[PDB]
Design a protein around this ligand. Structure first.
Ligand code: ZN
Ligand code: ZN
Ligand code: ZN
Length: 28
């Protein structure tokens, strides 16, 4: 349960980072 919660939160954090990065690239 602990491992699965950890890897789930990291994947969400990486998805938010990708969302933020894509935003920046679209701003050129
Ligand atoms: Zn978050
Ligand atoms: Zn994307
Ligand atoms: Zn922007």
């Amino acid at each position: 349960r602990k491992f699965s919660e950890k890897i789930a939160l990291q994947k969400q954090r990486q998805a938010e980072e990708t969302a933020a990065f894509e935003e920046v690239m679209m701003d050129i």
